[PDB]
Write an enzyme that holds these catalytic residues in place. Sequence first.
Site, PDB file in Angstrom:
ATOM      1  N   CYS A 147      86.290  47.519 173.348  1.00  0.00           N
ATOM      2  CA  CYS A 147      85.831  46.082 173.778  1.00  0.00           C
ATOM      3  C   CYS A 147      86.864  45.297 173.272  1.00  0.00           C
ATOM      4  O   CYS A 147      87.559  45.209 172.391  1.00  0.00           O
ATOM      5  CB  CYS A 147      84.556  46.108 173.109  1.00  0.00           C
ATOM      6  N   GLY A 169      85.532  51.135 170.329  1.00  0.00           N
ATOM      7  CA  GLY A 169      86.677  50.152 169.824  1.00  0.00           C
ATOM      8  C   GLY A 169      87.524  49.655 170.839  1.00  0.00           C
ATOM      9  O   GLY A 169      88.551  49.019 170.438  1.00  0.00           O
ATOM     10  N   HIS A 217      79.422  40.496 171.055  1.00  0.00           N
ATOM     11  CA  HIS A 217      78.868  41.431 170.135  1.00  0.00           C
ATOM     12  C   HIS A 217      79.594  41.926 168.958  1.00  0.00           C
ATOM     13  O   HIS A 217      78.928  42.805 168.167  1.00  0.00           O
ATOM     14  CB  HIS A 217      78.292  42.462 171.235  1.00  0.00           C
TER      15      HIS A 217
END
Lengths: 299, 302
Positions: free
Chosen positions: B145, B143, B41
């Site tokens: 991920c 932030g 993503h």
Amino acid sequence: GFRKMAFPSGKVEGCMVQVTCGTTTLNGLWLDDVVYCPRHVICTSEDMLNPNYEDLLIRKSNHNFLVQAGNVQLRVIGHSMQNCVLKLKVDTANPKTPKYKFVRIQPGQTFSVLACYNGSPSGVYQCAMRPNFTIKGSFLNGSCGSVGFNIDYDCVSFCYMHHMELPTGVHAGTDLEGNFYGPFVDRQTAQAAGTDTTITVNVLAWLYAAVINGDRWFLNRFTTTLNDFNLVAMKYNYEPLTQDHVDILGPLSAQTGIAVLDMCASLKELLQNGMNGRTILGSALLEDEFTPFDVVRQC
Amino acid sequence: SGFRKMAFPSGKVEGCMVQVTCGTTTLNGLWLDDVVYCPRHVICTSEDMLNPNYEDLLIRKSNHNFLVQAGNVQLRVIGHSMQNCVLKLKVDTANPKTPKYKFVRIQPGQTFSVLACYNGSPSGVYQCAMRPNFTIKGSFLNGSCGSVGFNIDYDCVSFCYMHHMELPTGVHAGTDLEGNFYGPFVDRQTAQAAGTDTTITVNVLAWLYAAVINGDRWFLNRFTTTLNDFNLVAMKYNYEPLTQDHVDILGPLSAQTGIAVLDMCASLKELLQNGMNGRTILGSALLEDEFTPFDVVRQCSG
Ligand SMILES: *[C@H](O)[C@H](C[C@@H]1CCNC1=O)NC(=O)[C@H](CC(C)C)NC(=O)OC[C@H]1C[C@@H]1C1CCC(F)(F)CC1
């Protein structure tokens, strides 16, 4: 979410070495061209009960010390002793040496422990310096010389080196100048600590953390004065709360909009009435090893 | 108690963390040999989040659209592909700090260390357990991920988790390093519910063995049970049923204490049916379920 979090330990792992003297092996901290380790490595089982360390040390040669960094032996070209820490000078400098300083932490402050065995890092976890200057660690045989630290920016502040376990299962050690935290001594004797107390400013920070994460069954409409709270705290063997503690908690108070003294009133109710089977952030006990800084950074 | 949650030393993983940016979206990636692994993503805009067409979003991408950095040093991307919910970016430099590693898919109940990272920089390390409903109770901010979970055995890092999302209840969800989600979740900015969580029975048993090892053994009874009988009772208390693998991984602790697994099961059954009655185990009235049998042996015997 909210979790007990240690600093990333890589900068410290690059400094851990194995130190052997006689049949005693423990860990050392290799910074620039010096290896730091607990001086009791020079003891035999007969020495440990009342070791005259200055006497024992003058009878040692550089070659009685075996330092290994992984597969490589380092040549000891000099040795000295600073309080309970032995300093071994070696011919090679450690390229993995981080920017660092040696600090002495205050009771209530937290730090990360890198537990090592035979010079190899094994685990990392967060500890607080207890008010009675013990730490509730996880340290087994061979863990001596493991260090505690914080990281600010790229700078590692070393604050703890591990030396011993007490009969109650808690732990004791020194700063990196070799001075013990607390009234303990590096001799093989059963030692007791003074009465421990709970770190009140940290319990309050943790309660604020529980609110942030949507847990607030413990809050109440009541308030309290600082002194009246401190009277109750001391009765329950909680440390007194200072105005600097109140100030330090400001950010968490602003964020949640709960006045510090309002949270103090909630904690008072918890001390007097208990948790009633309930839990806070999973715990059935009030947690006191998160500083306000720990809670702020993570929220 | 004499136990605390202990993470693995994080240095071997710190040496693999990078950041991956598409446009203004930055998350973390894992740099092993000449490949960087990250959540797919990263290629989403705010408007793609709702229901992204990942295949279409990717076809419009070129190697030169991906900014990969170790610190402030750019790593040139020379190939890209999607594997489930992970992006694999081939880069022109092999990571000199690549440890010995493997990619593993863990079972619920197993524990692992998480190195929480932001902009490719590690912030902290902590131990997590995979819940039976395939969530973890992490501490992740925006932030985070691409932060990974791992175990270390001897010199070998087993990567088992990569972080992708937060659920409305505040727990966290993600994939293995082959991009397959744990649990029924998908990487879309929608409301998704985890199933009802349950207690990790194998870990509670590990905890009871830990108590025995430390001399706290009032709860041992003279009885035993079949595995099936125990599992049927356990489920009525929202405990997970035991598998054969659970029985096997309790083997070392059973051997260390001489207490057969099924005898300990009978002791746990009695605790479930009769309660603690104001007693404690290892200092607590609550049974712990986030220490595995491996964790117990680590902290008792080293
Ligand atoms: C260094 O690795 C070692 C770490 C200890 C070992 C177990 N867990 C740890 O954290 N430290 C020591 O071995 C020191 C050495 C002395 C010279 C300081 N000794 C201890 O930590 O011993 C623990 C005491 C509670 C044990 C016992 C000691 C003998 C006794 F006095 F007779 C009765 C009490």
